[PDB]
Protein backbone atom coordinates (compact mmCIF):
# COMPACT_ATOMS: atom_id res chain seq x y z
CA UNK A 1 0.00 0.00 0.00
CA UNK A 2 3.20 2.34 0.56
CA UNK A 3 4.32 1.36 -2.76
CA UNK A 4 1.51 1.05 -4.91
CA UNK A 5 1.77 0.53 -8.33
CA UNK A 6 0.62 2.77 -10.36
CA UNK A 7 -0.17 1.61 -14.42
CA UNK A 8 -1.41 4.33 -17.31
CA UNK A 9 -3.85 2.74 -19.45
CA UNK A 10 -4.58 4.34 -23.20
CA UNK A 11 -5.12 3.66 -27.00
CA UNK A 12 -7.30 0.80 -26.31
CA UNK A 13 -11.11 -0.34 -25.74
CA UNK A 14 -11.74 -0.84 -21.85
CA UNK A 15 -15.13 -3.30 -21.28
CA UNK A 16 -15.81 -2.14 -18.25
CA UNK A 17 -18.92 -4.54 -18.24
CA UNK A 18 -16.90 -7.60 -18.28
CA UNK A 19 -14.49 -6.87 -15.47
CA UNK A 20 -17.39 -5.67 -13.85
CA UNK A 21 -19.15 -8.72 -14.38
CA UNK A 22 -15.75 -10.84 -13.58
CA UNK A 23 -15.41 -11.34 -9.96
CA UNK A 24 -17.20 -10.92 -6.52
CA UNK A 25 -15.62 -7.69 -5.90
CA UNK A 26 -17.10 -6.77 -2.44
CA UNK A 27 -16.74 -2.98 -3.22
CA UNK A 28 -17.58 -1.13 -6.80
CA UNK A 29 -17.51 2.25 -5.70
CA UNK A 30 -17.51 4.75 -8.54
CA UNK A 31 -17.57 8.20 -7.55
CA UNK A 32 -18.09 10.68 -10.53
CA UNK A 33 -19.53 8.46 -13.04
CA UNK A 34 -21.81 5.57 -12.66
CA UNK A 35 -20.54 2.19 -13.73
CA UNK A 36 -23.29 1.16 -15.95
CA UNK A 37 -21.93 4.20 -18.07
CA UNK A 38 -18.47 3.25 -18.18
CA UNK A 39 -18.80 1.59 -21.24
CA UNK A 40 -20.70 4.45 -23.21
CA UNK A 41 -17.53 7.42 -21.91
CA UNK A 42 -14.37 8.04 -23.44
CA UNK A 43 -11.60 8.98 -20.92
CA UNK A 44 -8.18 10.46 -22.00
CA UNK A 45 -5.77 7.82 -19.51
CA UNK A 46 -6.80 5.26 -16.87
CA UNK A 47 -4.85 4.96 -14.14
CA UNK A 48 -5.18 1.61 -12.35
CA UNK A 49 -3.64 2.45 -8.54
CA UNK A 50 -2.76 -1.60 -7.11
CA UNK A 51 -2.27 -2.58 -3.83
CA UNK A 52 -3.27 -4.77 -1.02
CA UNK A 53 -5.18 -3.01 2.15
CA UNK A 54 -6.59 -4.77 5.38
CA UNK A 55 -10.70 -5.18 5.59
CA UNK A 56 -10.49 -2.53 8.25
CA UNK A 57 -8.84 -0.04 6.25
CA UNK A 58 -11.09 -0.63 2.88
CA UNK A 59 -13.04 2.23 3.61
CA UNK A 60 -10.32 4.68 3.94
CA UNK A 61 -10.03 4.33 0.28
CA UNK A 62 -12.62 7.21 -0.88
CA UNK A 63 -12.47 10.86 -1.18
CA UNK A 64 -12.97 12.81 2.09
CA UNK A 65 -11.37 9.83 4.53
CA UNK A 66 -9.09 10.14 7.35
CA UNK A 67 -6.84 7.49 8.65
CA UNK A 68 -3.32 6.08 8.81
CA UNK A 69 -4.11 4.85 4.59
CA UNK A 70 -5.40 7.81 3.89
CA UNK A 71 -2.81 10.24 5.42
CA UNK A 72 -0.04 8.22 4.92
CA UNK A 73 0.09 5.74 2.56
CA UNK A 74 -2.51 6.61 -0.51
CA UNK A 75 -4.68 9.90 -0.35
CA UNK A 76 -7.43 10.19 -3.00
CA UNK A 77 -8.59 13.95 -3.92
CA UNK A 78 -11.36 15.34 -2.83
CA UNK A 79 -12.28 15.88 -6.68
CA UNK A 80 -11.82 11.87 -7.32
CA UNK A 81 -13.41 10.96 -10.41
CA UNK A 82 -13.49 7.44 -11.53
CA UNK A 83 -13.91 4.20 -9.39
CA UNK A 84 -12.74 2.14 -6.27
CA UNK A 85 -12.34 -1.90 -6.93
CA UNK A 86 -11.80 -4.08 -3.79
CA UNK A 87 -12.11 -7.71 -3.36
CA UNK A 88 -10.97 -10.16 -0.39
CA UNK A 89 -7.96 -12.08 -1.54
CA UNK A 90 -7.77 -14.62 1.66
CA UNK A 91 -6.60 -17.15 -0.81
CA UNK A 92 -3.63 -15.47 -2.01
CA UNK A 93 -2.44 -12.76 -0.07
CA UNK A 94 -2.55 -14.22 3.55
CA UNK A 95 0.02 -17.37 4.55
CA UNK A 96 -0.79 -19.60 7.60
CA UNK A 97 3.08 -18.35 8.98
CA UNK A 98 1.92 -14.83 8.23
CA UNK A 99 2.19 -13.13 4.93
CA UNK A 100 4.48 -10.17 5.51
CA UNK A 101 5.71 -8.76 2.33
CA UNK A 102 3.16 -5.72 2.44
CA UNK A 103 3.98 -2.75 4.92
CA UNK A 104 1.92 0.30 5.97
CA UNK A 105 3.35 3.42 6.47
CA UNK A 106 2.84 4.45 10.47
CA UNK A 107 4.67 7.54 11.22
CA UNK A 108 5.02 10.82 8.78
CA UNK A 109 5.46 14.50 9.43
CA UNK A 110 2.61 16.01 7.05
CA UNK A 111 0.15 13.75 5.67
CA UNK A 112 0.46 12.63 1.86
CA UNK A 113 -0.99 14.94 -1.28
CA UNK A 114 -3.34 13.28 -3.54
CA UNK A 115 -2.03 10.74 -5.62
CA UNK A 116 1.59 11.05 -4.00
CA UNK A 117 3.63 7.73 -3.15
CA UNK A 118 6.60 8.21 -0.31
CA UNK A 119 8.82 5.04 -0.04
CA UNK A 120 11.10 6.42 2.12
CA UNK A 121 12.29 4.12 4.76
CA UNK A 122 14.28 6.31 7.00
CA UNK A 123 13.45 6.89 11.01
CA UNK A 124 11.14 8.79 12.10
CA UNK A 125 12.04 10.97 14.77
CA UNK A 126 9.17 11.32 17.14
CA UNK A 127 11.41 12.89 20.21
CA UNK A 128 13.84 15.86 19.97
CA UNK A 129 17.08 13.91 20.55
CA UNK A 130 18.26 12.87 17.14
CA UNK A 131 17.66 9.48 15.56
CA UNK A 132 20.73 9.44 13.14
CA UNK A 133 19.85 6.68 11.53
CA UNK A 134 19.48 4.74 14.32
CA UNK A 135 15.70 3.11 15.61
CA UNK A 136 15.42 3.27 19.59
CA UNK A 137 13.55 5.81 21.97
CA UNK A 138 11.83 7.88 20.12
CA UNK A 139 12.83 6.78 17.10
CA UNK A 140 10.40 4.44 15.03
CA UNK A 141 10.18 2.75 12.11
CA UNK A 142 7.85 4.40 9.48
CA UNK A 143 6.60 1.12 7.79
CA UNK A 144 4.70 -1.29 9.82
CA UNK A 145 3.80 -5.10 8.42
CA UNK A 146 0.25 -6.42 8.35
CA UNK A 147 1.24 -10.01 8.97
CA UNK A 148 -1.90 -11.77 7.22
CA UNK A 149 -2.84 -15.37 8.06
CA UNK A 150 -6.14 -17.24 6.57
CA UNK A 151 -7.10 -17.39 10.50
CA UNK A 152 -7.68 -13.76 11.12
CA UNK A 153 -10.43 -11.87 11.25
CA UNK A 154 -12.76 -10.81 8.52
CA UNK A 155 -12.14 -7.33 8.96
CA UNK A 156 -8.35 -8.12 9.38
CA UNK A 157 -7.96 -10.16 5.74
CA UNK A 158 -6.27 -8.34 3.04
CA UNK A 159 -8.44 -7.16 0.20
CA UNK A 160 -6.69 -6.45 -3.19
CA UNK A 161 -7.65 -2.85 -3.97
CA UNK A 162 -7.88 -1.22 -7.78
CA UNK A 163 -8.13 2.23 -8.31
CA UNK A 164 -9.15 3.16 -11.77
CA UNK A 165 -8.75 6.95 -11.80
CA UNK A 166 -10.37 8.29 -15.41
CA UNK A 167 -8.96 11.53 -16.56
CA UNK A 168 -12.15 12.76 -17.61
CA UNK A 169 -11.34 15.57 -20.47
CA UNK A 170 -12.48 13.98 -23.43
CA UNK A 171 -10.33 16.04 -25.96
CA UNK A 172 -7.68 13.76 -26.43
CA UNK A 173 -9.84 10.57 -25.88
CA UNK A 174 -8.01 7.08 -26.54
CA UNK A 175 -9.66 4.78 -23.80
CA UNK A 176 -13.23 4.59 -24.88
CA UNK A 177 -15.98 1.38 -23.92
CA UNK A 178 -17.14 -1.24 -26.48
CA UNK A 179 -18.86 -0.73 -29.95
CA UNK A 180 -22.37 -1.54 -30.45
CA UNK A 181 -22.98 -3.84 -33.70
CA UNK A 182 -26.70 -3.47 -34.99
CA UNK A 183 -27.04 -5.85 -37.83
CA UNK A 184 -27.11 -3.85 -41.58
CA UNK A 185 -30.66 -3.44 -43.13
CA UNK A 186 -30.46 -2.82 -46.73
CA UNK A 187 -33.33 -1.54 -48.74
CA UNK A 188 -35.07 -0.48 -46.09
CA UNK A 189 -35.57 3.47 -44.37
CA UNK A 190 -34.03 3.09 -41.75
CA UNK A 191 -32.14 5.39 -39.12
CA UNK A 192 -28.35 4.90 -39.64
CA UNK A 193 -25.48 5.65 -37.58
CA UNK A 194 -21.83 5.39 -38.69
CA UNK A 195 -19.11 6.54 -36.90
CA UNK A 196 -21.25 8.72 -34.76
CA UNK A 197 -22.36 11.03 -38.24
CA UNK A 198 -26.13 10.19 -37.65
CA UNK A 199 -29.06 9.98 -40.55
CA UNK A 200 -31.77 8.45 -42.46
CA UNK A 201 -32.03 6.78 -45.45
CA UNK A 202 -32.38 3.77 -47.48
CA UNK A 203 -28.98 1.92 -47.48
CA UNK A 204 -28.20 -0.06 -51.12
CA UNK A 205 -25.11 -1.86 -52.39
CA UNK A 206 -22.92 0.80 -54.63
CA UNK A 207 -20.72 -0.03 -57.10
CA UNK A 208 -18.45 3.02 -56.35
CA UNK A 209 -14.56 2.72 -56.13
CA UNK A 210 -13.73 4.16 -53.29
CA UNK A 211 -10.02 4.59 -52.37
CA UNK A 212 -8.69 2.77 -49.34
CA UNK A 213 -8.08 5.66 -46.85
CA UNK A 214 -11.46 7.16 -47.55
CA UNK A 215 -15.02 6.87 -45.61
CA UNK A 216 -17.71 8.26 -46.81
CA UNK A 217 -18.54 10.22 -50.27
CA UNK A 218 -20.53 13.21 -50.99
CA UNK A 219 -22.42 15.01 -53.50
CA UNK A 220 -22.17 18.06 -55.24
CA UNK A 221 -23.58 20.00 -52.80
CA UNK A 222 -21.65 18.18 -49.99
CA UNK A 223 -24.45 15.79 -48.64
CA UNK A 224 -23.56 12.40 -47.39
CA UNK A 225 -23.86 10.14 -50.56
CA UNK A 226 -22.37 7.07 -49.24
CA UNK A 227 -20.28 5.19 -46.56
CA UNK A 228 -18.19 2.53 -45.50
CA UNK A 229 -19.41 -0.23 -42.96
CA UNK A 230 -16.67 0.28 -40.18
CA UNK A 231 -17.42 -3.24 -39.31
CA UNK A 232 -17.16 -4.80 -43.39
CA UNK A 233 -14.96 -2.55 -45.54
CA UNK A 234 -18.26 -2.18 -47.93
CA UNK A 235 -19.46 0.85 -49.83
CA UNK A 236 -23.21 1.35 -48.79
CA UNK A 237 -25.46 4.05 -50.89
CA UNK A 238 -27.94 6.52 -49.03
CA UNK A 239 -30.57 7.67 -50.86
CA UNK A 240 -33.39 9.89 -48.50
CA UNK A 241 -36.33 7.87 -47.75
CA UNK A 242 -39.07 9.19 -50.96
CA UNK A 243 -40.91 11.95 -49.77
CA UNK A 244 -43.83 14.21 -51.39
CA UNK A 245 -46.69 16.46 -51.71
CA UNK A 246 -49.52 14.70 -51.11
CA UNK A 247 -52.52 16.68 -53.60
CA UNK A 248 -55.80 15.51 -53.62
CA UNK B 1 25.14 -7.14 -3.75
CA UNK B 2 23.51 -8.63 -0.23
CA UNK B 3 26.05 -11.20 1.39
CA UNK B 4 25.22 -13.12 4.05
CA UNK B 5 28.11 -14.68 6.57
CA UNK B 6 27.49 -17.66 9.29
CA UNK B 7 29.66 -18.85 11.96
CA UNK B 8 32.66 -21.54 11.63
CA UNK B 9 32.05 -25.00 11.95
CA UNK B 10 30.54 -25.94 15.32
CA UNK B 11 31.38 -29.79 16.96
CA UNK B 12 28.80 -30.56 19.57
CA UNK B 13 27.85 -33.58 21.71
CA UNK B 14 24.17 -35.33 21.97
CA UNK B 15 21.89 -33.59 24.16
CA UNK B 16 23.72 -30.35 24.00
CA UNK B 17 23.00 -27.19 22.73
CA UNK B 18 24.13 -24.96 19.27
CA UNK B 19 23.88 -21.59 18.35
CA UNK B 20 24.85 -20.23 14.71
CA UNK B 21 25.27 -16.41 13.59
CA UNK B 22 24.26 -14.90 9.86
CA UNK B 23 25.41 -12.01 9.82
CA UNK B 24 23.25 -9.97 7.15
CA UNK B 25 26.03 -7.22 5.05
CA UNK B 26 24.10 -5.01 2.58
CA UNK B 27 20.71 -3.70 2.39
CA UNK B 28 18.18 -2.96 4.38
CA UNK B 29 17.67 -5.39 7.38
CA UNK B 30 14.24 -4.22 8.15
CA UNK B 31 12.32 -5.69 5.56
CA UNK B 32 13.61 -9.07 4.43
CA UNK B 33 12.96 -12.20 6.61
CA UNK B 34 16.07 -14.23 7.36
CA UNK B 35 15.00 -18.15 7.47
CA UNK B 36 17.57 -21.09 8.26
CA UNK B 37 17.18 -24.21 6.49
CA UNK B 38 19.04 -27.30 7.44
CA UNK B 39 20.38 -30.40 4.83
CA UNK B 40 21.46 -33.44 6.50
CA UNK B 41 24.04 -35.37 4.24
CA UNK B 42 22.02 -37.74 1.40
CA UNK B 43 18.89 -36.18 2.41
CA UNK B 44 17.12 -32.93 0.77
CA UNK B 45 16.61 -29.75 2.01
CA UNK B 46 14.77 -28.92 5.23
CA UNK B 47 13.24 -25.65 6.55
CA UNK B 48 13.87 -24.71 10.44
CA UNK B 49 12.55 -21.26 11.32
CA UNK B 50 12.09 -17.87 10.13
CA UNK B 51 12.93 -14.48 11.80
CA UNK B 52 10.78 -10.85 10.63
CA UNK B 53 12.69 -7.91 11.32
CA UNK B 54 9.56 -5.94 10.30
CA UNK B 55 7.61 -7.65 13.17
CA UNK B 56 10.35 -8.37 15.51
CA UNK B 57 8.54 -11.85 15.73
CA UNK B 58 10.39 -15.36 14.94
CA UNK B 59 8.63 -18.43 13.87
CA UNK B 60 9.56 -22.04 14.21
CA UNK B 61 8.88 -24.93 12.49
CA UNK B 62 5.86 -27.42 13.12
CA UNK B 63 8.42 -30.40 13.18
CA UNK B 64 10.35 -28.75 15.86
CA UNK B 65 8.30 -27.79 18.77
CA UNK B 66 10.52 -25.51 21.14
CA UNK B 67 13.67 -26.68 19.64
CA UNK B 68 14.32 -23.69 17.57
CA UNK B 69 14.64 -20.23 19.23
CA UNK B 70 15.67 -17.65 16.88
CA UNK B 71 16.94 -13.91 17.85
CA UNK B 72 18.62 -11.60 16.27
CA UNK B 73 20.55 -7.95 17.02
CA UNK B 74 18.88 -5.37 14.80
CA UNK B 75 21.74 -2.65 15.81
CA UNK B 76 24.29 -5.30 14.21
CA UNK B 77 22.34 -6.97 11.54
CA UNK B 78 23.40 -10.36 12.81
CA UNK B 79 21.11 -13.41 13.38
CA UNK B 80 21.06 -15.83 15.62
CA UNK B 81 19.31 -19.21 15.24
CA UNK B 82 19.46 -21.20 18.28
CA UNK B 83 18.94 -25.01 18.61
CA UNK B 84 18.22 -27.37 21.75
CA UNK B 85 18.50 -31.13 22.55
CA UNK B 86 21.25 -31.78 19.62
CA UNK B 87 20.57 -35.51 18.72
CA UNK B 88 22.99 -38.01 16.02
CA UNK B 89 20.32 -36.73 13.43
CA UNK B 90 20.72 -33.07 13.43
CA UNK B 91 24.39 -33.24 11.85
CA UNK B 92 23.52 -31.04 8.85
CA UNK B 93 24.77 -27.84 7.59
CA UNK B 94 22.48 -24.61 8.75
CA UNK B 95 22.15 -22.63 5.66
CA UNK B 96 20.40 -19.06 6.33
CA UNK B 97 18.86 -17.84 3.74
CA UNK B 98 17.20 -14.30 3.03
CA UNK B 99 13.40 -14.56 2.07
CA UNK B 100 13.73 -11.37 -0.33
CA UNK B 101 11.25 -9.89 -2.73
CA UNK B 102 9.40 -12.44 -3.85
CA UNK B 103 9.21 -14.65 -0.71
CA UNK B 104 11.73 -16.89 -2.20
CA UNK B 105 15.02 -17.75 -0.88
CA UNK B 106 17.21 -15.44 -3.18
CA UNK B 107 20.18 -14.88 -0.97
CA UNK B 108 21.56 -17.82 0.49
CA UNK B 109 24.38 -17.91 3.05
CA UNK B 110 27.61 -20.38 3.16
CA UNK B 111 26.42 -22.55 5.49
CA UNK B 112 28.17 -23.90 8.50
CA UNK B 113 28.51 -27.79 9.09
CA UNK B 114 27.37 -28.98 12.56
CA UNK B 115 28.39 -32.21 13.65
CA UNK B 116 26.86 -33.67 16.92
CA UNK B 117 28.48 -37.04 18.07
CA UNK B 118 30.78 -38.11 20.89
CA UNK C 1 1.80 -29.12 7.08
CA UNK C 2 1.70 -29.31 3.15
CA UNK C 3 3.77 -32.31 1.54
CA UNK C 4 5.91 -31.70 -1.46
CA UNK C 5 6.37 -34.52 -3.50
CA UNK C 6 8.39 -35.13 -6.27
CA UNK C 7 8.58 -37.23 -10.14
CA UNK C 8 11.32 -38.48 -10.84
CA UNK C 9 13.38 -38.69 -7.98
CA UNK C 10 16.18 -39.56 -9.64
CA UNK C 11 16.85 -39.03 -13.58
CA UNK C 12 19.59 -39.43 -16.01
CA UNK C 13 19.67 -37.12 -19.19
CA UNK C 14 22.51 -36.31 -22.24
CA UNK C 15 23.42 -32.48 -23.06
CA UNK C 16 21.25 -30.49 -25.15
CA UNK C 17 17.91 -32.61 -24.29
CA UNK C 18 14.90 -32.01 -22.70
CA UNK C 19 14.24 -32.64 -19.39
CA UNK C 20 11.09 -32.72 -17.30
CA UNK C 21 10.57 -32.61 -13.90
CA UNK C 22 7.59 -32.47 -12.15
CA UNK C 23 6.73 -31.33 -8.20
CA UNK C 24 3.28 -31.68 -7.20
CA UNK C 25 1.50 -30.48 -3.95
CA UNK C 26 -0.90 -32.06 -1.85
CA UNK C 27 -2.75 -28.88 -1.25
CA UNK C 28 -3.84 -25.74 -3.52
CA UNK C 29 -0.70 -23.24 -2.86
CA UNK C 30 -2.10 -21.35 -5.85
CA UNK C 31 1.08 -20.20 -7.56
CA UNK C 32 3.76 -19.91 -4.74
CA UNK C 33 6.44 -22.35 -5.90
CA UNK C 34 10.10 -21.73 -6.10
CA UNK C 35 12.70 -23.83 -7.86
CA UNK C 36 16.34 -24.39 -6.58
CA UNK C 37 19.45 -25.90 -7.59
CA UNK C 38 21.96 -27.66 -5.76
CA UNK C 39 25.26 -28.25 -6.88
CA UNK C 40 27.23 -30.90 -4.54
CA UNK C 41 29.34 -28.59 -2.03
CA UNK C 42 27.02 -25.59 -2.75
CA UNK C 43 24.55 -23.42 -1.61
CA UNK C 44 21.44 -23.86 -3.38
CA UNK C 45 20.38 -21.21 -6.05
CA UNK C 46 17.13 -19.47 -6.75
CA UNK C 47 16.03 -20.25 -10.43
CA UNK C 48 11.97 -20.31 -10.58
CA UNK C 49 10.25 -18.13 -8.67
CA UNK C 50 6.14 -17.86 -8.87
CA UNK C 51 6.36 -21.17 -10.27
CA UNK C 52 6.58 -18.99 -13.50
CA UNK C 53 9.15 -16.11 -13.52
CA UNK C 54 12.57 -16.41 -14.07
CA UNK C 55 15.33 -15.48 -11.40
CA UNK C 56 17.73 -12.82 -12.48
CA UNK C 57 20.85 -14.18 -13.50
CA UNK C 58 19.30 -17.64 -14.41
CA UNK C 59 19.87 -18.81 -18.33
CA UNK C 60 17.00 -18.42 -20.20
CA UNK C 61 16.88 -22.09 -20.68
CA UNK C 62 15.36 -23.00 -17.50
CA UNK C 63 11.39 -22.81 -17.32
CA UNK C 64 8.41 -23.22 -15.45
CA UNK C 65 5.03 -23.68 -15.82
CA UNK C 66 2.09 -25.39 -14.07
CA UNK C 67 -0.40 -24.09 -10.84
CA UNK C 68 -2.36 -25.53 -8.24
CA UNK C 69 -1.52 -28.73 -7.14
CA UNK C 70 1.02 -30.13 -9.67
CA UNK C 71 3.98 -28.02 -11.15
CA UNK C 72 6.84 -28.44 -13.67
CA UNK C 73 10.37 -27.30 -14.68
CA UNK C 74 11.52 -28.06 -17.72
CA UNK C 75 14.91 -27.25 -19.92
CA UNK C 76 14.88 -26.38 -23.15
CA UNK C 77 18.47 -27.03 -23.98
CA UNK C 78 20.57 -29.08 -20.98
CA UNK C 79 24.21 -28.40 -20.76
CA UNK C 80 26.72 -29.81 -18.74
CA UNK C 81 26.57 -27.26 -15.99
CA UNK C 82 23.11 -28.05 -15.18
CA UNK C 83 23.44 -31.20 -14.00
CA UNK C 84 22.58 -30.83 -10.11
CA UNK C 85 19.86 -31.78 -7.84
CA UNK C 86 16.14 -29.25 -8.00
CA UNK C 87 14.32 -28.52 -4.99
CA UNK C 88 11.00 -27.28 -4.99
CA UNK C 89 9.54 -24.51 -2.38
CA UNK C 90 5.86 -24.27 -1.54
CA UNK C 91 6.03 -20.51 0.50
CA UNK C 92 2.33 -20.14 0.66
CA UNK C 93 2.14 -21.79 4.23
CA UNK C 94 5.24 -20.83 6.70
CA UNK C 95 4.28 -23.59 9.21
CA UNK C 96 6.23 -25.26 7.65
CA UNK C 97 8.09 -24.28 4.53
CA UNK C 98 8.54 -28.25 2.71
CA UNK C 99 10.84 -28.68 0.10
CA UNK C 100 10.70 -31.05 -2.35
CA UNK C 101 12.63 -34.59 -2.27
CA UNK C 102 14.84 -34.24 -4.54
CA UNK C 103 15.93 -34.51 -8.10
CA UNK C 104 19.11 -35.74 -8.88
CA UNK C 105 20.26 -34.69 -12.85
CA UNK C 106 23.03 -37.38 -13.49
CA UNK C 107 24.53 -37.74 -17.40
CA UNK C 108 23.25 -40.52 -19.62
Known amino acids: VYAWNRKRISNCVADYSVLYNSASFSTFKCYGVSPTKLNDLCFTNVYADSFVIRGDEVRQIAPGQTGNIADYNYKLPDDFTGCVIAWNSNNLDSKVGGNYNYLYRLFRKSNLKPFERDISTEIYQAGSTPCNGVKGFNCYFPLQSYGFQPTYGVGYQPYRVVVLSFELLHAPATVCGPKKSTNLVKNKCVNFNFNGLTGTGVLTESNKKFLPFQQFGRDIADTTDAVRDPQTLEILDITPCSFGGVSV | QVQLVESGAEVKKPGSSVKVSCKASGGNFNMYTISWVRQAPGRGLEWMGR????????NYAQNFPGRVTITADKSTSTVYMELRSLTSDDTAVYYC???????????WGQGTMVTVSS | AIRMTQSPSTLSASVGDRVTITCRAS??????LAWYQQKPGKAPKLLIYDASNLESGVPSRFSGSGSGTEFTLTISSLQPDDFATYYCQQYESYSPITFGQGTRLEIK
Open chain 2, 51 to 58: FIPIANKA
Open chain 3, 27 to 32: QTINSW
Open chain 2, 97 to 107: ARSGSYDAFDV
